[PDB]
Amino acid sequence: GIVEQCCTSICSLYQLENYCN
């Protein structure tokens, strides 16, 4: 999940938009 993919690897703002309500 994003606690690995954004932190240990790199993620985009477009990928963060998937995890909005």
Next chain:
Amino acid sequence: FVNQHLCGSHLVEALYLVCGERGFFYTPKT
């Protein structure tokens, strides 16, 4: 758009700034 390393409070802040007042739910390590 852009891409970065983002962790913890900075990840939760970036997610909140992408989503706005609509809210969110982050997924854990696995």
